[PDB]
Amino acid sequence: GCCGSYPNAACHPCSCKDRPSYCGQ
């Protein structure tokens, strides 16, 4: 994914720059 295999304190598949687009569609 993107937060997949990374820290998660703030990080989500969404806060990423070009994120896993499930946090939209």
Side-chain angles (χ1 to χ4, degrees):
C2 175
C3 212
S5 308
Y6 273 90
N8 222 127
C11 180
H12 203 245
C14 177
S15 186
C16 286
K17 288 284 291 187
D18 179 31
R19 68 321 285 166
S21 57
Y22 10 110
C23 137
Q25 185 179 110

